[PDB]
Amino acid sequence: KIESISEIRLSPKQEEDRALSDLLNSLLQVFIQQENYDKSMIERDKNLLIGGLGVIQLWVSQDKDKNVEIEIKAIKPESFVIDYFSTDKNALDARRFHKMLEVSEQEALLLFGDSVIVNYSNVNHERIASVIESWYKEYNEETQSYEWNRYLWNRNTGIYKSEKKPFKNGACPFIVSKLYTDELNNYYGLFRDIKPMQDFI
Amino acid sequence: KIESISEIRLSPKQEEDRALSDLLNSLLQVFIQQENYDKSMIERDKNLLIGGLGVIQLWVSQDKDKN
Amino acid sequence: FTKEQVFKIVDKKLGDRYFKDDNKIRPLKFDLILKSQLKTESRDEKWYNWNELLKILAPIRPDLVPSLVPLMLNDMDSPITNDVLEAIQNANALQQQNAEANAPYNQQIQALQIQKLQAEIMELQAKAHK
Amino acid sequence: FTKEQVFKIVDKKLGDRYFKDDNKIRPLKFDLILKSQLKTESRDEKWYNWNELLKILAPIRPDLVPSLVPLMLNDMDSPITNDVLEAIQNANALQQQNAEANAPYNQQIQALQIQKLQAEIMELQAKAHK
């Protein structure tokens, strides 16, 4: 899978869409040939093969010089909780995604200002914090469409920061796929069918 | 079966039906190259092979922009 | 599927060939035959059909072949297609420009040869008369 | 992606072909088809497509081929490309310089042949008259 890394090219449906598509295939190259792409894809394939989950998030960070960029990051699947009501692979009928993050102190200061109270830890000397970032699918009442909202919160502390529709379209940044969903709604992976052979060896 | 996914193309019976059929083969491509097609076909084949049933439903949803 | 829904999906020629109606696609019962094939995109299938058709039509009728290659290249999924099409347009414009620039000399030569062959008529008739 | 963000990434021709708007890329629903392929850089893919297209178009239409090789060589990732392009420009400049230097002799020969073929008309007409 390392040398067969798949990209997606775009093709026109009509004849007039070609000047669109050959534009967008030129604009996806700065998303393709970035440094994080191959790392996120190989981490994704390792998580899909060892376990059953593959989680890749996207971001639209814009640093200083009007330069909009699409960051890509593969998420560790053990620090990622899906809605229990979603039964299918790719997690499309999911209403919420939770990720439990470790956050350092100055990254928590940059993430939100000092006006709200942070429940830090004291693990050795550095005051880290455990922050749960939840993404909720809720339909609006002004427009009748679903939008995704972000809540950075801590258990037994409350909500640190609540933002609604923080992507100009109400799109969830996570792309999830489960390999081998089974009964009782678990991901099965390639590990369980080859595990007793390894134990016998 | 994953790489031998079968689509259905339409052929004209008479000579005058070709302008119909080459129209409809262009209109089935938005049904073919959608994201749910390969997932539904592979789930169908898995259900037909593991068990005996294969059930696929279709819908004519129209969201907001006369689409 | 409404008519504006159809014309947002298909090309202009494919829409104009079917609607000569009543703004609705009305297929009859004995009109279509369902044939199964491998799931491929339409431009790749048209490209393969264009390739085999140009390799078939080469010995039997060659003059049909160079009039088909813009219609072949319009159905190409390559990213170089928008350059090849304007290259074809520039070459055709230069060719017709050179043709319409050299055509007065050609019609001058034609009229002059006609006048020479008439002058031979009147010369031989005058010799026969004298 | 803003318009100046797009025009910093793509070429001038790729930007001008799409924006004939409202300064935003507005793709419709039935416009794009997603096709998976191997992850390769754009100039290498365009180079391979140019190579197969020039090997296809060689027997069927040869006169299209020498007008495509600057457009092929512009899409080359080789370090010698900036030398080959100025070599092409110098060769084209020398060719058009020789053509525009030799063209007065060619039009002189054309007018002189026209005058000779008219002199034949008046000669044969005078012979027929006498």
The Cα–Cα gap between D81 and D71 comes to: 12
User: Any alpha helices (H) in chain A, and if so which ranges?
Assistant: 18-27, 29-32, 36-50, 105-111, 191-200
- How far D45 CA lies from chain A's nearest CA (Å)? 11
Residue C124, φ and ψ in degrees, nearest 5: -70, -35
DSSP codes of every residue in C46-70: HHHHHHHHHHHHHHH-GGGSTTTHH
Closest listed residue to residue B66, CA positions, set A44, A181, C7:
C7
Cα→Cα distances D42→A23, A28, A114, D75, D100, Å: 12, 10, 46, 9, 39
The Cα–Cα gap between C19 and C25 comes to: 9
Cβ of residue C34 closer than 8 Å to a chain D Cβ: no
CB D64 within 8 A of CB C69: yes
Instruction: Say yes or no for a CB contact (<8 Å) between B39 and A89.
Output: yes
If you compute the radius of gyration of chain D from its CA atoms, what whole number of angstroms results?
27
Cα→Cα distances D13→A12, A192, C3, D40, D107, Å: 18, 54, 33, 22, 38
CB A155 within 8 A of CB A121: no
- How far B58 CA lies from chain C's nearest CA (Å)? 15
A193's tokens:
């069918």
Task: Write the residue in C9, C17, C34 that is nearest to B27 by C-beta.
Answer: C9
The Cα–Cα gap between B29 and B33 comes to: 6
Task: Write the residue in A12, A33, A66 that is nearest to D2 by C-beta.
Answer: A66
State the best of A2, A15, A20 to mutate against chain D, taking most chain D CBs within 10 Å.
Answer: A20
Task: Write the residue in D1, D36, D37 that is nearest to A27 by C-beta.
Answer: D1
User: Any alpha helices (H) in chain D, and if so which ranges?
Assistant: 3-7, 12-18, 42-60, 69-73, 81-129
- How far B51 CA lies from chain D's nearest CA (Å)? 31
The 3-state DSSP class for residue A112 equals: coil
Number of H helices, E strands in chain B: 3, 1
The Cα–Cα gap between A154 and A92 comes to: 26
- How far B14 CA lies from chain D's nearest CA (Å)? 30
Task: Write the residue in A11, A14, A25 that is nearest to C11 by C-beta.
Answer: A14
Find chain C residues with C-beta within 8 A of A19's C-beta. Answer: 82
Cβ atoms within 10 A of the Cβ of A176, count? Answer: 21
Sign of CA dihedral A186, A187, A190, A195: negative
Task: Write the residue in D4, D14, D32 that is nearest to A17 by C-beta.
Answer: D32
Cβ of residue D117 closer than 8 Å to a chain C Cβ: yes
Find chain A residues with C-beta within 8 A of D35's C-beta. Answer: 8-11
Instruction: Say yes or no for a CB contact (<8 Å) between A145 and B39.
Output: no
Find chain D residues with C-beta within 8 A of C80's C-beta. Answer: 46, 49-50, 53, 71, 75
Cα→Cα distances A45→A8, A179, C56, C101, Å: 17, 11, 45, 64
Beta bridge partners of A97: A82, A135
Task: Write the residue in A11, A14, A19 that is nearest to C82 by C-beta.
Answer: A19
- How far D55 CA lies from chain C's nearest CA (Å)? 13
The Cα–Cα gap between D108 and C68 comes to: 40
Instruction: Say yes or no for a CB contact (<8 Å) between C43 and A11.
Output: yes
Residue A76, φ and ψ in degrees, nearest 5: -60, 120
B18's tokens:
């070709």
A155's tokens:
């258990």
Resolution of this model in Å is 3.6
Instruction: Say yes or no for a CB contact (<8 Å) between B24 and C35.
Output: no
Chain CA centroid to CA D80, Å: 21
